[PDB]
RNA sequence: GCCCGGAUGAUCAGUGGUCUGGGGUGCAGGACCUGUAUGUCUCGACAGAGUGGUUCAAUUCCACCUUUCGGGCG
């Protein structure tokens, strides 16, 4: 009778390996774990009649370490190719191919249907941008500059410098309450400097309001006309239909060479992995081969486990819920602000992040804006970013005026809040309740 | 009575946090897990009265993912500093400090007593060398070349190219059976090229016989005299008293700016992490700050769990056992080779790796050397590297003659075998038994 | 710092103070923190420990030790399964707490007047046995147990294992329901004599068309003749109607203990039970009658489950069981219409339903026997098929009309039930495959 | 490909073929692969499943489900704890295999002629009870159980729970050892009469200075008078001398069953036991006497442990228990010398030792009572201290000289033991803290 | 479970990711398991589903035409 039992799991598994797409409904844990166990025993470190006389054998001293990784020890890839099948680890190599294939499937469902290729890379989004820039150097050996429409996030700014290039900060234009791409200045800069001296244009979709996603269609056309590479920082934009649509359109009407996303921000897994994806299949393969040596299999295993358990239906559900929570948070901030003579900034073009003003707090008199930020933290509100006026800040030599606000002089101090994937109404209701108590105390 | 119970564990824990060294004897699992649980609940994602309105909150969709990481989700560091305390994750930040502090303790016990500083970085050894080279670019903006005494390992070679420099391959000199540093050629090259055009000298300790660790004392003096940075690839050399001693001596008599080690090869944990360590405390801090964004906490958690369970006594034990297994493997290969009219190459200066000759196999007639390698693999011998004559190979544009042998014309084909940490007699006895059967079949 | 560990301690300190279920379930982090701190209270988990005894709690396999959260010593002392074990302070605390939580749930479920109870790691059958074994010393001339019939081999055999002779009282057909023959019960105590009766042994939960025994009338019979009353409540914790029935019987008459399965009511593995009652002293006597130490595994399962669910967690599950019962009923009604069958009118049973199989031929086509075999291979579990004229021998006693709880029920029938944790998918998949099963069995 | 999964299948296919322990332990990867494939054979783990029953194996907490490897249905059918459960094919297989492995170990340990045995998830006390309960139906006029005294509350109470009256036979002081009063046993069967005796109930393993009962002489007494013989072998599987003693008694006389703890012999959590015997039919009858389904938890613990250890794993543990026994002995000898005490000469006991405490005053300084309390706070477990004149009441019967197994042993004494899994550290830490304990108690 | 207006126009003769006529309308391993199986972004707008593999994208949307209906006019 030990037949028809397996035969239902074997089929969900054979179906996964042949067509490479997410299951529509999530696997039961019993299936997932049977599968992980079937892969792990395919690696040579887990063979029964095995001897190892090499210096890298996947030996594990602690049993707590081996059990928590489902006995996957050899990482992904070979030394010369992170995407190559590892003969010492047939099972881990298969894992890598399936995970990458699932991630590709989700990029499509999420919005970029024309994606040609992608891979999971066990560094975060900053360092994966850096690996993009490091790959471009070889192609454009005269190139010295990366043109970068400003965003006050220390990681993607430093990514250009760790790669050893010079970022050219293109300030944004203030349209209403929104901060947007200065397409005039960007094109003036590629001409002042010269296409040959530009490594790439580096744009951002996901960001804190009142910045909004960059004008990707326009920027991609500039890039196609001047023969300049386009790199998109899409850090948490997989969860946003609008963001994924910009990338999609930017590639249709113009040029996008790669776009980069975080794993934790989009798939709800621990920090430390990212996806590099693109439309030229061979260029994405090239970034892959620029990675020296083997890498951790952890972020891949986390992603594989998460997508198989959720299914594409579980994803669609979370994505729909995120949109709904954005409306509900938006309306709640509208209601709460009004009571304090503040307003929700008009930022329609930003689908994930919102801002509430703080004009009624005097920072130079009572240091109230900072104080608000501090109080929110000690009331265990997380992610509530306060942004004061006129903060100078130096990051890797370069000085920012009005830092955290994405421009030298925004009209007012404000407070961020987001609806990111996984949010529950309790988050918003507790946020609103705690912000209310906080403002009340500051203004008393 | 819920007092004196905790009070024995609390003390092992308070002792760990105050003096920062390994326990001498390993903790019981009950203590380790109590500690991990005490840290995890210190992170805000695990707070009970928590709401999150940000885009990175450490949300975990699958319970299998959260439980297997002991609920550590936020990774290590902040965006501007991978070594900074994370206010959203006080517990993960503490983990990072303890792990780094334990690793420092083990570097000392293992041999480099004068180490000033180190950190765990969740990329492998190749990419961590790259992060070293990326840090040096800023200091030596005229520098274009890395001088590199040859070793046929695709990862550390590519590391120089991914960083965007040009490796200058310095061939080795054949002394007896051993391949060693050409100190003549290295110093001739820094003069032909010019100190200002050298980014660093890149040397290797651990490697496959018949190469041997590089002459670090001499190379460090060359580096101190010409004001050139010295980077040591010490990939699996923590386990070797002799290797760690070279690094130690090289820093005493000369200059070493950083040395890099793998986690899996030395601490028996999954692939995907490395340690960057050095003698100038501020320079090591600088490599740290060149890493853009946050990173995975996984390889650190693996290391913390492994060292607390083993203790420094468990390490000393494994290190002693490795030496003994090297003798036993050495003697066994001596015995087996003799029976086939082969010999164990005289490579006294290499403490981890051995080689047996294969002169009695005709590769151009019967393709026997390749065939041997193939048969060893299908008999589930792992790490048994076969090295034929005259294999050409291209790696990132650069062509290698006699690849895998570290020089253009080694006298013979040979077979590697190692005694790396964690080896058991069964490995050697099964290796010998299976190699014997293999040679017999090839020569019949 | 550790101003964050405090709110975890609050939930734990509140559980130890009053010993009631939390209204909202604990997060896993809190639970596992609590469990890991109970386990280091046990002497076998002490750091400075040497053991020169024969029961030291040594564990050979790490897999085994980890899966029990390092609880090895079981519950109890060898002389009292309800005593603190000095060598296992943590496991003793675990056992006190589990019993306290389980007491709260019995009250919450409908028996608010329950005085005491304990978890025992045998199943319901063998716990009923422990009740009888305890009654033997109080009634040493007793030989008989009066038992309103129910065709279930475990409660029946529990009387023979204890060493008494079960006196089977057939049921009365009252409409479509099978109910307690109260007159034949009372006649049996008059014929055999009260002193010769160990107890009356009745049953709340059961398969339709049997319904809960009339506990009030039996509790009064037992009060008058001075006979103890033991109620088999195997899976009636999930039914407020069964629990209120037990509460009412205790109010107007006499109920000495009532026994419940852990796995049918709390959704944990098979193996443990609850013995409860209204007389603090007698429930203590059944506990003290247990020889030796016992597994802590079913306590730890219940404790993890209640702390994870909470009051509200439990209330919700109990409310949805009702809704699934209506839904399963309407669905059986509708499906039965289309096959010229009907839903037996058994309104007194709140858990189990029955549907007629008159139109299926069992003596010429053997379709009734085959409908069972069919529902199985289509992976329907728990849908039991009851034929006509099934003779069966359990422990020497031979039943006519087995599975039907009487010798000649009017028709063959099919059971289905709404047991706690049932989802709308369970009903819908069942209706579907039954429909394909009947349709296919008419060819 | 999957030419690597094959060698795992080989180990599993070999276990199912012959059902013996592997000589070398399985790797965890093999074990967990085996267990995860047994668990998907259970209907509650089927993918296309709907459940309309009242026992469907629903699990509310993921923590609970995972820690039992998704085994929820327990072992057995409600009518036979030794039957295949169609709703749980995997758990039935788990149960067959565990029993087969455990049979192999009984043989390996010294009773090569054992015919049958089964794991039962009650402890040794309540399993002894199940034996008596099974004998009641075969001997319905019996009232008494003849019992060579041993001061341990669980085996003593097991006779009263079953409903029989224990007839205590005091022991003979033979040297320093307490042994079976064979003449007083035989006189008691002649006074009460064989037909009134349910069985003789003897004991192999015990605390020094009691030693294993004379099973051969009692097995012959039982053969002649036609009385059943039940042996309490609670922790004697680990002693080849106890097992050979049981093997010899069966050879020359009559032994009906012998009972063993799982936790004392196999280093798993408290809770389960083995009932074994030489008559295939009678061991089957004790199994069939169990009402209902039972926990699978202690089976799964034993199965994980034996497959991890193997034959050799077990042999080694048993060999080291001997070596620790010599070592503990020499160490007690040496330490006792320095305190003007001695090691009671009890050569017939292979597990437990005793050391005199003559020089400690218990009636003027109360040092004997206090040495116990002291060894505890210094975290010595299992070192039990036996005073003089300890009166005690268990279940109405009052013992004089409790813990000493007679009314007037010559002196107070202290027990220590070499039980399986003991390490040289255990002895050395004990010798040390005893030495600091005595030294401190003379002031 | 005029396993084997309106099979799955030529792989029920639900729907954007050059997958022609569970008539008419608006087997194997003017139980009338005109495996209109021939969503030579914001009005061997963006995507041979008749004229996965051998508009960026259309099921052998618009106009593993032909046909047809309805309205185990006359
Ligand atoms: C998260 C994020 C990044 C990358 O951050 P890492 O810490 O490197 O993952 C870059 N830019 C923005 C706007 C982000 O939100
Ligand atoms: C392991 C190793 C490296 C680094 O390899 P990664 O795969 O990047 O960890 C470099 N050089 C040598 C000689 C090695 O053995
Ligand atoms: C350990 C032991 C038992 C076991 O009793 P439990 O019911 O398992 O507590 C019984 N009798 C004796 C003599 C023992 O040593
Ligand atoms: C479920 C049930 C039992 C429980 O019997 P076990 O001994 O747990 O197998 C007993 N009686 C009835 C009527 C039941 O429905």
Numbering used by the authors:
A (entry chain A), B (entry chain A): 20 to 463
C (entry chain B), D (entry chain B): 21 to 463
Please quote the paper that reports this structure.
SepSecS converts the phosphoseryl (Sep) group into the selenocysteinyl (Sec) moiety in a mechanism that requires selenocysteine tRNA (tRNASec) and a pyridoxal-5-phosphate (PLP) cofactor. Recently, two research groups reported that four distinct mutations in human SEPSECS caused congenital cerebellar atrophy termed pontocerebellar hypoplasia type 2D (PCH2D).
To establish whether mutations T325S and Y334C alter the structure of SepSecS, we solved crystal structures of holo T325S and the T325S-tRNASec and Y334C-tRNASec complexes. The binary complex crystals belonged to the trigonal space group and contained two SepSecS dimers and one tRNASec molecule in the asymmetric unit, whereas those of the holo T325S were of the orthorhombic space group with half of the SepSecS tetramer in the asymmetric unit. The side chain of Tyr334 is in helix α13 near the active-site pocket. Furthermore, we expected that replacing Tyr334 with a much shorter Cys residue would remove a hydrogen bond between the side chain of Tyr334 and the backbone carbonyl oxygen of Asn285. This, in turn, could have resulted in repositioning of the PLP cofactor and presumably reduced catalytic activity of SepSecS. A global structural comparison showed that T325S and Y334C tetramers adopt the same structure as the WT enzyme. However, since tRNASec is essential for mammalian development, it is reasonable to suggest that Y334C most likely exhibits marginal activity in vivo to explain the viability of the homozygous Y334C patients.
